[PDB]
Design an enzyme around this catalytic site. Structure first.
Site, PDB file in Angstrom:
ATOM      1  N   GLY A   1      -0.321  -3.671   4.127  1.00 39.36           N
ATOM      2  CA  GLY A   1      -0.571  -5.091   4.294  1.00 39.36           C
ATOM      3  C   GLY A   1       0.526  -5.805   5.060  1.00 39.36           C
ATOM      4  O   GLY A   1       1.659  -5.328   5.133  1.00 39.36           O
TER       5      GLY A   1
ATOM      6  N   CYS B   1       0.786  -1.226   0.000  1.00 37.64           N
ATOM      7  CA  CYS B   1       0.000   0.000   0.000  1.00 37.64           C
ATOM      8  C   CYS B   1       0.825   1.287   0.000  1.00 37.64           C
ATOM      9  O   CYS B   1       0.566   2.196  -0.788  1.00 37.64           O
ATOM     10  CB  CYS B   1      -0.937   0.007   1.210  1.00 37.64           C
ATOM     11  SG  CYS B   1      -1.955  -1.477   1.384  1.00 37.64           S
TER      12      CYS B   1
ATOM     13  N   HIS C   1      -8.448   2.863  -4.372  1.00 39.24           N
ATOM     14  CA  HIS C   1      -7.140   2.665  -3.753  1.00 39.24           C
ATOM     15  C   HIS C   1      -6.166   1.885  -4.635  1.00 39.24           C
ATOM     16  O   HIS C   1      -6.026   0.669  -4.496  1.00 39.24           O
ATOM     17  CB  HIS C   1      -7.302   1.949  -2.406  1.00 39.24           C
ATOM     18  CG  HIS C   1      -6.005   1.540  -1.774  1.00 39.24           C
ATOM     19  ND1 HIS C   1      -5.051   2.449  -1.371  1.00 39.24           N
ATOM     20  CD2 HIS C   1      -5.504   0.316  -1.484  1.00 39.24           C
ATOM     21  CE1 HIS C   1      -4.017   1.803  -0.862  1.00 39.24           C
ATOM     22  NE2 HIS C   1      -4.267   0.507  -0.917  1.00 39.24           N
TER      23      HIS C   1
ATOM     24  N   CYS D   1      -2.144   2.609   6.243  1.00 39.93           N
ATOM     25  CA  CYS D   1      -1.857   1.275   6.750  1.00 39.93           C
ATOM     26  C   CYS D   1      -1.327   0.432   5.598  1.00 39.93           C
ATOM     27  O   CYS D   1      -1.676   0.665   4.441  1.00 39.93           O
ATOM     28  CB  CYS D   1      -3.129   0.642   7.312  1.00 39.93           C
ATOM     29  SG  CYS D   1      -4.483   0.544   6.116  1.00 39.93           S
TER      30      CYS D   1
END
Ligand code: ACO
Ligand code: ACO
Ligand code: NAD
Ligand code: N8E
Ligand code: N8E
Ligand code: N8E
Lengths: 715, 390, 390
Positions: free
Chosen positions: B378, B94, B346, B376
């Site tokens: 993964g 991310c 996203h 955040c």
């Protein structure tokens, strides 16, 4: 020699290396009966006492390593109190524990099947060598219990929580490739070089190259998972299984609770946990016979074996009719190394078949799962044709002609004059009696029923409908041919609806009644999906098709008028009479609007209420608990009838046919086990309050007979 | 005053966020999408010689097919950027795009380059996430496999902090609502670079908005969806989860020195950078650790930050993060004022710089001084960046 | 004395380089291979608390299947490294591993972390290079497609500088011979970390050498091979090209400050880092530009460098690079004294740190002061690093 027992012969070898061999003299296989466990004790103590030993190799002098356990002689050792039971298993585990504590390298050369206790013996050793043609697993769950010989202790720390929970809860067998990947095995080799691998490996452990001590450690200490990582791992495992196992949880939901508790513990303390929980299952969940499930499996492994080597090898096969079912039967037979012929009458048919078979092959290549060179072989395996000129060497022929008693008979009798006389013929029909079709043929002994489920490549189950004049060799060949195609065949006697379908509609009968009772089908399937079913009743009906289900209803009604012939318009007739033909039409209990190539959508619309109004005969109130009974009871009872009328031969086969076919909640066992999960005596009582619904909720005489006797189906 | 080696974000330009399931980018490669963005952004700033670009750092996750083989260079070669420049692709799931910004920042600070071109891209349409995945069984020996399923983690972190289905859906509505507004009011006109695409009819036309946004999203329509990661008792639905979106985001970065020389006014200035780790099971909690580390390095309290951009992975994770950061009661006043990943999509390798870039535009537009962009990651990770308007 | 924020390489450990076509690693995942390496390396250094590792920067190219989804964290989670740490995968094709070293270096220098664990991995056996490739047609509009075929570039660069078939084959021989020598004499015992594997018989055993090495490689045996990238008039053969190898390399890095505090003697110290670009057609020429930039930043002349590690992609590219660097006449005296990628294999995402790591061992072993590790990158790139022994 060091030790010469009747089950174990501990023979010495070179460099002080000793070979503990498992060879139950007199019997066909090796198993952990009283005698075997006793000799192991004597064997371990022998090696242990002998200080000249520099390593131990464990092998087998049979075709299989060590199969399950013959629990019949452990039963009297289960009725004792939980203390004299836990300590009992504990004492048994002392053997494996000691073998695991031998200050010397130990390798397990797995030559064949190593299930249940057989694998637990291997998990004890430091290293494990395996033949690529072998299988290992812990099917204890099918018995209502989980590994009792350190299985829940070693496996979780050897391959990992998630992997252990999966291997255990499911009780699935595992091939070399898979066993090696999760690291349950350390090396896979050809059967021929098995012994050499074990020997060469041991010597590498002795020399110090391989740290056998460091490899053993993992299953003597706590798990490597975080306190938080454990909460996640266990809760998810417990949750997923809790929903598909339901209220009477055998080994699945318990096995995980046993690992979750013994998580921060070492071997010894973990063993106590395993033992304690094991006693709970045997005296509660499985008290309603563990004997039955076990012996039932025993009968099967032997039955599947008797069939296995009397069966005729199917080097050449063929299918009658391309298109939908033909393209699948051709695909499956081609993808598993079986040259098949796609016979048909018009060129347009062969096109449909070749196309579908091609669409599937390309499907895997166009993402990375199949080799372009592999797609070539498979395609060459399928050989189109509009005649019978090449049917000369075909061993087994399958029919897929349109659903028509007359047509199928003509086609079947036709092919019978173009193949060897010793060739087996099989129809794929679903609503026609095999015993009826056979009459057309002049060699009924070779004719049976091979039932596949749409899609042929998706559904696992394949019913082997035996006719009244079907020879064992005929069934044996078909069963084997199914297994080779990566399927799970089950022998079923000829009857309207056979096993699966015959039981699938009574289930829908309970649904039809619900809808007629003003019960919202949306609420219904949400409850059935919360029960464990893949798809809901209404949703399933849409997938199968209202037009199809409508036809099937008549097929079953004519079959057993005494109980399956209702006469009041139901949601089935409502939707059919209202042009709502299901998912294929775009409208059934739900609406389906298609996105593109591979995706379509399930929608809700109040317009369906109008069509169902004429079916509502009462605005009856019902709990989600009752909804499950209106459905399950009719399905279970019919299973009992299929077992009583002699449609299925054993209770074991009567349940798997539902697990693989209709999609019966796996962790709940089956229709018959579910009954035991409640108690046969307590099940008949439950059935009686719903007796006001019809003959579909009326216990059989044989069920009432075994009701008072405190008898359950698994024993 | 200026410190020669201070990191300065000169400009920021992103692509119109389009749906993956047959969206406006279904016929455009990730490479080209990135190349075009970088090229167009460089045009708006004709005073920064493309030749000076010491390196192009692009963030991308599923690096295979179109996105494989260092897409940073592959997309940089089709740009006016000389062949004399370099390019690397940074993957951190991310936070890939943001880590890219950090790499360049550090480079500039240490005197290993003057001008950089950072950003990221992720075309989840042509290169889906579940595409080409091989779960290593060995992982279950050190961590729960379930932690690999971002959704389940959202469920777990959610239960812990106690966020109701209503609380989550309400957040999604706020995201869509605030995204549409920002779009209509033109608060996106500066950052969104018009880009060619194809409508549902295969026709060619230029889009300058975000397909992902759904103004009709109401609590009623959201309360109709079913649990996506846990049917039997779940709150995390597709409605409260970020969208699968194909998109790219760019950002030209350089030293204040070489910047002052070009006489071009800065958009923002990086003050602190931080990355932290958490347990995979509750990866959504990554922001708080990463943020706290950034605030300490920037010598600032959470209160000193005027505006915040928290990548909305799941309403079930965004809310908890905001609560522990002690700013939940300040949401509508300074948190994701233009919507989040739930309405804006996203794009894995893109979201990093995208949320940061949007953060700057919020500050500039609302006279903010200190800003914070965090997200955040993964498998248990977090990343934060504290910018400054001067 | 050293400055607080000076980058210091504490230790270096690599795996035995095994063949991909059924080699010793045919049954070992890239993730595990990396996780094990990082774990074992941290063991030899019991004074560096794994919890202090601010981040794990791992290099990898074909990030899909086993190597997909930020393998840095995936391999880090199975290590003693806490979940509180972070991890990112840096891809720059060939120079991936080295870029990793740079990223951490700059981080340390800027005060964004104290202890790092850099390295790279590439299991070309499980995830081959040609696997999942989608050539973007548009690339031919800005650059020749042929430039994508590393082999053909070697041919072109070779033709230019004029390297005969014999000149290349002779180079390969020197690489194999020197590799075997260093192996037999134990010049690899310190860097090579014994690792479990399977021999040609599926038997389990630990390897501590490099299968890739072929001592029998003679000018006669190499002159028998046929052109691999150009049958009708070629010189680049499989023998003079790097080997397809599965392998990982690790490296613990930290600031001199936190290092001096732990009282552990440094292995080397980074003085300058550089990356440069060249035309894709002759990407093999990447080292010279990258090196020249590094030497200037390090304030050193090419002559001041005692030992050189030039990753041997092709004899056709290594030789030209050495000629223009004006050190060809110094080859046997200070250039790849332990062999190159031709005999030790070239794991894309790994070679970066591997060549650098081996570079340090050469210096330490031969009392060197200044060292240089550089390598050419695909699609026209270069990277260089100048270490220092103190
Ligand atoms: N991982 C993830 O982030 C999530 O699990 C996802 C994004 C992959 C889930 O998406 P998918 O599983 O691919 O598709 P999904 O099964 O959820 O279906 C999407 C449907 O939900 C709808 N939907 C999604 N979000 C919303 C919302 N906020 N409000 C209303 N409808 C919504 C879509 O419109 C679509 O309906 P359609 O097919 O009729 O157009
Ligand atoms: C810029 C950078 O940093 S890296 C640049 C990127 N380069 C690479 O990735 C490497 C490129 N190389 C390749 O792709 C492959 O190695 C190729 C295409 C050159 C060759 O592969 P193939 O076409 O399959 O031929 P193959 O590898 O099978 O040839 C092996 C044969 O060569 C022989 N051989 C190889 N090396 C030697 C040697 N040193 N001495 C003697 N014989 C040798 C083998 O014995 C074998 O012969 P055999 O088949 O009779 O047993
Ligand atoms: C199940 O599956 C079967 C139905 O299969 P389906 O879904 O493909 O039906 P279908 O209607 O989709 O296709 C029927 C196929 O059988 C072929 N066929 C019909 N009569 C034939 C004959 N005399 N000789 C050779 N081929 C003939 C047709 O050409 C066609 O390819 C049934 O047994 C049902 O119970
Ligand atoms: C498919 C079947 C699975 C087989 C796995 C076996 C698991 C069942 O465990 C059986 C419970 O064990 C009871 C212990 O028996 C106590 C009597 O001890 C035997 C004598 O050994 C004494 C050694 O000192
Ligand atoms: C519910 C009962 C309905 C009864 C239906 C009666 C159907 C009876 O029809 C008889 C079957 O007709 C066979 C059709 O003949 C096809 C011949 O195909 C020859 C193809 O030759 C190909 C040569 O290359
Ligand atoms: C009497 C004629 C009516 C024929 C209807 C046959 C009914 C069988 O349905 C087949 C179509 O399949 C679509 C629905 O899928 C059911 C899901 O079951 C999944 C099985 O799960 C197996 C788990 O081991």
């Amino acid at each position: 020699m060091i030790y010469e027992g009747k089950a174990i012969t501990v023979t010495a070898l070179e460099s002080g290396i000793v070979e503990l061999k498992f060879d139950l003299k007199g019997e066909s296989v090796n198993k952990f009966n009283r005698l075997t466990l006793n000799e192991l004790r004597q064997a371990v103590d022998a090696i242990k006492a002998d200080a000249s030993v520099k390593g131990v190799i464990v092998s087998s002098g049979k075709d299989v390593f060590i199969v399950g356990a013959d629990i019949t002689e452990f039963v009297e050792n289960f009725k004792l109190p939980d203390a004299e039971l836990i300590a009992g298993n504990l004492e048994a585990n002392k053997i494996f524990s000691d073998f695991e504590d031998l200050n010397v390298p130990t390798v397990a050369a797995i030559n064949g099947i190593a299930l249940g206790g057989g694998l637990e013996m291997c998990l004890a050793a430091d290293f494990r060598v395996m033949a690529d043609s072998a299988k290992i697993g812990l099917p204890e769950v099918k018995l209502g219990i989980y590994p009792g010989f350190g299985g829940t202790v070693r496996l979780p720390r050897l391959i990992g929580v998630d992997n252990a929970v999966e291997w255990i809860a499911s009780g699935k067998e595992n091939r070399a490739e898979d066993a090696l990947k999760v690291s349950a095995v350390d090396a896979v080799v050809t059967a021929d070089k098995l012994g050499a691998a074990a020997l060469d490996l041991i010597k590498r452990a002795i020399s110090g190259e391989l740290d056998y001590k460091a490899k053993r450690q993992p299953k003597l200490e706590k798990l490597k998972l975080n306190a938080i990582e454990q909460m996640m791992a266990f809760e998810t495992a417990k949750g997923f299984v809790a929903g598909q196992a339901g209220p009477n949880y055998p080994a699945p939901v318990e096995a995980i609770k046993t690992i979750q508790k013994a998580a921060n513990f070492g071997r010894d303390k973990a063993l106590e946990v395993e033992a304690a929980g094991f006693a709970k299952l045997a005296k509660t969940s499985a008290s309603n016979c563990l004997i039955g499930l076990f012996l039932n499996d025993q009968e099967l492994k032997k039955k599947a074996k008797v069939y296995d080597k009397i069966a005729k090898d199917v080097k050449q096969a063929a299918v009658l009719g391309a298109g939908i079912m033909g393209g699948g039967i051709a695909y499956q037979s081609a993808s598993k190394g079986t040259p098949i012929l796609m016979k048909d009458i018009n060129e347009h048919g062969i096109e449909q078949g070749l196309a579908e078979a091609a669409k599937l092959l390309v499907g895997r290549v166009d993402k990375g799962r199949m080799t372009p060179a592999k797609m070539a072989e498979v395609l060459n395996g399928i050989r189109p044709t509009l005649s019978y000129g090449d049917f000369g060497n075909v061993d087994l022929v399958v029919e897929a002609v349109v659903e028509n008693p007359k047509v199928k008979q003509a086609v079947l009798a036709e092919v019978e004059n173009h193949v060897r006389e010793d060739a087996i013929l099989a129809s794929n029909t679903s609503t026609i009696s095999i015993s009826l079709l056979a009459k057309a043929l002049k060699r009924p002994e070779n004719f049976v029923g091979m039932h596949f489920f749409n899609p042929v490549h998706m559904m696992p189950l394949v019913e082997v409908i035996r006719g009244e004049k079907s020879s064992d060799l005929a069934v044996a060949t078909t069963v084997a041919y199914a297994k080779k195609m990566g399927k799970n065949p089950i022998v079923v006697n000829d009857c309207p609806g056979f096993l699966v379908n015959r039981v699938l509609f009574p289930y829908f009968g309970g649904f039809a009644k619900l809808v007629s009772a003003g019960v919202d089908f949306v609420r219904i399937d949400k409850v059935m999906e919360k029960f464990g079913w893949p798809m809901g009743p209404a949703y399933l009906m849409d997938v199968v098709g209202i037009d199809t289900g409508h036809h099937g209803r008549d097929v079953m009604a004519e079959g057993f008028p005494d109980r399956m012939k209702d006469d009041r318009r139901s949601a089935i007739d409502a939707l059919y009479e209202a042009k709502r033909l299901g998912q294929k039409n775009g409208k059934g209990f739900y609406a389906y609007e298609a996105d593109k190539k591979g995706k379509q959508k399930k929608l809700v619309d109040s317009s369906v209420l109008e069509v169902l109004k004429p079916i509502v005969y009462e605005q009856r109130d019902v709990t989600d608990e009752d909804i499950i009974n209106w459905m399950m009871i009719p399905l279970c009872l019919e299973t009992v009838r299929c077992l009583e009328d002699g449609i299925v031969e054993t209770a074991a086969e009567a349940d798997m046919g539902l697990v693989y076919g209709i999609g019966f909640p796996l962790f709940r066992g089956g229709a018959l086990r579910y009954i035991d999960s409640i108690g046969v005596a307590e099940f008949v009582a439950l059935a009686d309050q719903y007796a006001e619904l019809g003959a579909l909720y009326h216990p059989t005489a044989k069920l009432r007979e075994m009701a008072k006797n405190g008898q359950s189906f698994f024993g | 005053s200026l410190n020669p080696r201070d990191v300065v974000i000169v400009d920021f330009g992103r692509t119109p966020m389009g749906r993956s399931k047959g969206g406006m980018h279904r016929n455009t490669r990730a490479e080209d999408m990135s190349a075009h963005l970088i090229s167009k952004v460089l045009e708006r700033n004709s005073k920064v010689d493309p030749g000076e670009v010491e390196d192009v750092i692009w963030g991308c996750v599923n690096q295979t097919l179109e996105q494989g083989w260092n897409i940073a260079r592959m997309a940089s070669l089709m740009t006016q950027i000389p062949h004399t420049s370099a390019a690397q692709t940074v993957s951190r799931l991310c936070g890939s795009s943001m880590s890219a910004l950090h790499t360049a920042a550090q480079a500039i600070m240490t005197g290993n380059g003057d001008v950089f071109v950072v950003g990221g891209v992720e075309h989840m349409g042509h290169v889906s996430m579940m595409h080409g995945v091989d779960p290593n069984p060995h992982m279950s020996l050190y961590a729960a496999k379930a932690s690999g399923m971002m959704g389940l983690t959202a469920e777990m972190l959610g239960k812990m902090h106690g966020i109701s289905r209503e609380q989550q859906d309400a957040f999604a509505v706020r995201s869509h609502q605030l995204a549409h507004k920002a779009t209509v009011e033109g608060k996106f006109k500066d950052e969104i670079i018009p880009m060619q695409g194809y409508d549902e009819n295969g026709f060619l036309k230029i889009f300058d908005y975000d397909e992902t946004i759904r103004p009709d999203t109401t609590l009623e329509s959201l309360a109709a969806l079913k649990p996506a990661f846990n049917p039997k008792g779940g709150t995390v639905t597709a409605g409260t989860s970020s969208q699968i979106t194909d998109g790219a985001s760019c950002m030209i970065v350089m030293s204040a020195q070489r910047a002052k020389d070009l006489g071009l006014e800065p958009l923002a200035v990086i003050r602190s950078m931080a990355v932290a780790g958490v347990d995979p099971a509750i990866m959504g909690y990554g922001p708080v650790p990463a943020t706290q580390k950034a605030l300490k390095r920037a010598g600032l309290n959470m209160a000193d930050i005027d505006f915040i951009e928290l990548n909305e992975a799941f309403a079930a994770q965004a809310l908890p993060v905001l609560k522990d950061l002690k700013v939940l009661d300040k949401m509508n006043e300074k948190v994701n004022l233009h919507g989040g990943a739930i309405a804006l999509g996203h794009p894995f390798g893109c979201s990093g710089a995208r949320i940061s870039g949007t953060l700057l535009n919020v500050m500039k537009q609302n006279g903010g001084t200190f800003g914070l962009s965090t997200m955040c990651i993964g498998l248990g990770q977090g990343i934060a960046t504290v910018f400054e308007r001067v």
